[PDB]
């Protein structure tokens, strides 16, 4: 409904601006452009190293009265080095301070993997593996619930959790709040209909990250399948006189999934909002779904031996 509704009642805007890889000197302008274009949901994260600058763009629009705080859906994410129970409130408070916000609308446990605490976001050992920590995300979750109780965040969720990790939370003795969201990688080459179905049976909204398959991911070694340059999606795009991009964004929306496409380019931010004006005919929907190569762009391979690494499971 141009939004999905979380089990709390909160209306979560269906399209949002993604800010990973959005450089600090560009993201304040991208956020500003986006809110002027009507975007009311911004997806952020401590680890993106730009929440201050996202904060500046929001601030300007808020004091410039272009939007009200109640009309904004700001998401941020607890990073892996901050999973120890006692580190969770501090990590949320830094994020609130950098975003210059009194509360978040959604705070997600970014990855199920907790890493050794410290300033390095990926503590690596001599073998190049990331160093784990003494925590289970069930304890992290208990601290995340405290943020709801104190009013720092309006809802809590998870990101990159496999269905068995969500289950461990749902079956937690003394559970106060469920994940309201599971933000996971979704796009034609990783359609995820089984995890989506599981989250939906549990009443957990799904946000699809990397709808365009992350062309700019640092590790895009040239012989990587490009969804935007994929002749097939370009053809179905042609049928609508829309771009590959607009089609790839319409797809998760049509599957009742929140999309958060990233762009620091003003023109492409406008383009990406110009998707609510058509519907993909069900055949085309089925075409796109069939491309499921189970191809993951964000596999976090460096953490593959972590006890809580999410991707060895089917879904
Ligand atoms: N929770 C997680 O662990 C996680 C993981 C990955 C991503 N995410 C979230 O999902 C967001 C989106 O994913 P992503 O940034 O990884 O990748 P993405 O949105 O799939 O791809 C962004 C790339 O596509 C380009 N692009 C955007 N709009 C375009 C358009 N209309 N036409 C042509 N090219 C276009 C961007 O270029 P320009 O920006 O230069 O225009 C950029 O190179 C992230 O920013 C982040 O907020 C979350
Ligand atoms: O937007 C993103 N959030 C993330 O956790 C991820 C996916 C996995 O890999 C990395 C690596 C570095 C980073 F800053 C971020 C990421 N991308």
Calculated CA dihedral for residues 92, 97, 100, 101, nearest 10 degrees: 30
251 is in an annotated binding site: yes
Give the number of the ligand closest to the Cα of residue 303: 2
Supply 129's token pair.
């593996």
Q: Give SS3 for 187.
A: strand
Residue 4 assigned to a binding site: no
- Residue whose C-alpha is closest to residue 263's, from 20, 3, 14: 20
Burial of 151 (0-12, 13-18, 19+ CB in 10 A): exposed
The resolution in angstroms reads: 2.3
**Nearest protein CA to atom 43 of ligand 1, as residue:** 216
Residue 205 CB partners (closer than 8 Å, separation 6+): 4, 6, 12, 157, 180, 181, 182, 199, 258
* Any ligand 1 atom below 6 A from CB of 30: no
Pocket lining: 211 vs ligand 1, CB cutoff 6 Å: yes
Strand partners, 158: 109, 182
Ligand 2, residues 16, 20, 79: which to mutate, most atoms within 8 A of Cβ? 20
Helices (H), the chain: 24-36, 51-63, 88-99, 137-149, 163-170, 193-202, 231-238, 244-254, 266-273, 282-290
| Annotated domain spans of the chain | 1-315
* Residue 195, ligand 1, Cβ within 6 A: no
- Name 62's Cβ contacts closer than 8 Å, sequence gap at least 6: 68, 69, 72
- Tell me the CA–centroid distance for residue 241 and ligand 2, in Å: 33
Q: How far apart are CA 228 and CA 215, in angstroms?
A: 8
DSSP code of residue 248: H
Query: To test ligand 2's pocket by mutation, which of 16, 22, 23, 45 has the most ligand atoms within 8 angstroms of CB?
Result: 45
Q: How far apart are CA 230 and CA 218, in angstroms?
A: 20
According to DSSP, the residues that pair with 14 across neighbouring strands are none
Beta 205-209 vs 258-259: how paired, if at all?
Answer: parallel
At 47, list the tokens: 């680890």
262 lines ligand 1 (CB under 6 A): yes
Put residue 5 in one of left, alpha, beta given phi > 0 → left and psi -120 to 50 → alpha: beta
Catalytic positions: 48
Does 171 show up as a binding residue in the annotation?
no
Q: Specify the pairing of strand 11-13 against strand 17-18.
A: unpaired
**What letter would DSSP give residue 46?**
G
What does the alpha-carbon distance between residue 152 and residue 165 come to, in Å, rounded to a whole number? Answer: 24
Spatial separation of the C-alpha atoms in residues 227 and 205, rounded to whole Å:
24
Whole-angstrom Cα distance, residue 197 to residue 206?
10
Spatial separation of the C-alpha atoms in residues 243 and 203, rounded to whole Å: 32
Q: What is the largest CA-CA distance in the chain?
A: 53
Query: What residues contact residue 192 under an 8 Å CB cut-off, 6+ apart?
Result: 184, 185, 186, 315
Neighbours of 180 (CB within 10 A): 22
Q: Which two tokens stand for residue 246?
A: 């607009």
CATH fold of the domain at 1-315: TIM Barrel (3.20.20)
Q: After which residues is the backbone of the chain broken at C–N > 2.5 Å?
A: none
Confirm if 211 and 188 have CB atoms less than 8 A apart. Answer: no
Q: How many CB atoms lie within 10 A of CB 81?
A: 23
Distance CA 209, CA 161 (A): 13
Residue with structure tokens 């995890």? 195
Identify the burial level of 201 via C-beta atoms within 10 angstroms of its C-beta, where 0-12 means exposed, 13-18 middle and 19 or more buried: exposed
Pairwise CA distance, residues 115 & 100, whole Å: 27
The bound ligand whose nearest atom lies closest to the alpha carbon of 187 is 1
* DSSP annotation of 84: S
Which protein residue's CA is at the shortest distance from atom 26 of ligand 1? 263
Tokens found for residue 7: 């089990």
Angle of helix 88-99 relative to helix 137-149, nearest 10 degrees, comes to 50
* Solved using: X-ray
Rounded to the nearest angstrom, the distance between the alpha carbon of 64 and the centre of ligand 1 is 28
> Which-ligand-closest: CA of 299?
2
């Amino acid at each position: 409904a141009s939004h999905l509704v979380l089990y709390t009642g909160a209306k979560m805007p269906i399209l949002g601006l993604g800010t990973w890889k959005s450089p600090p000197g560009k993201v304040t302008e991208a956020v500003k452009v986006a809110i002027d274009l009507g975007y009311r949901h911004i997806d952020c994260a401590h680890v993106y190293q730009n929440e201050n600058e996202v904060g500046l763009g929001l601030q300007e629009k808020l004091q410039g009265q272009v939007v009200k705080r109640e009309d904004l859906f700001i998401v941020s994410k607890l990073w892996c080095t901050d999973h120890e129970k006692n580190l969770v409130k501090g990590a949320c408070q830094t994020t609130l301070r950098d975003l210059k916000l009194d509360y978040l609308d959604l705070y997600l446990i970014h990855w199920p993997t907790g890493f050794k605490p410290g300033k390095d976001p990926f503590p690596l050992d001599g073998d190049g593996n990331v160093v784990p920590d003494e925590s289970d995300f069930v304890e992290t979750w208990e601290a995340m619930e405290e943020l709801v109780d104190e009013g720092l965040v309006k809802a809590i969720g998870v990101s990159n959790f496999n269905h068995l990790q969500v289950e461990k939370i749902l079956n937690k003795p003394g559970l106060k709040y469920k994940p309201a969201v599971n933000q996971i990688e979704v796009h034609p080459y990783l359609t995820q209909e089984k995890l989506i179905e599981y989250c939906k049976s549990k009443g957990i909204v799904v946000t699809a990250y990397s709808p365009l398959g992350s062309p700019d991911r640092p590790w895009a070694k040239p012989e990587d399948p490009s969804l935007l340059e994929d002749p097939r999606i370009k053809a179905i795009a042609a049928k609508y006189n829309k771009t590959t991009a607009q089609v790839l964004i319409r797809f998760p929306m049509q599957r009742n999934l929140i999309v958060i496409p990233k762009s620091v380019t003003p023109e492409r931010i406008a383009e990406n909002f110009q998707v609510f004006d058509f519907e993909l005919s069900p055949e085309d929907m089925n075409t796109l779904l069939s491309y499921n190569r189970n191809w993951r762009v964000c596999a976090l391979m460096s953490c593959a031996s972590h006890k809580d690494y999410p991707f060895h499971e089917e879904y």
